[PDB]
Symmetry: D2
Subunit: 20 residues, 4 copies
Amino acid sequence: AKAAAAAIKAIAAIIKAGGY
Amino acid sequence: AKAAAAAIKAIAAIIKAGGY
Amino acid sequence: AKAAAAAIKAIAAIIKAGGY
Amino acid sequence: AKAAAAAIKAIAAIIKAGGY
């Protein structure tokens, strides 16, 4: 469940930034 | 899609490290 | 990398619905 | 965070199938 912050909190912010 | 193998890299590795 | 706007695009909504 | 091994399990298979 560590994974289930750290990966998500990266990706849901990197999505916003990345412009996917 | 430029965001892809710039985030996904740092995610598919983090999946493994995270232990999903 | 064209795997992009199919995968993440669903997943960013599935995130919001998932309550991650 | 129980949204994890539903949406992640899709994504880690969509990665493999997608060729990111």
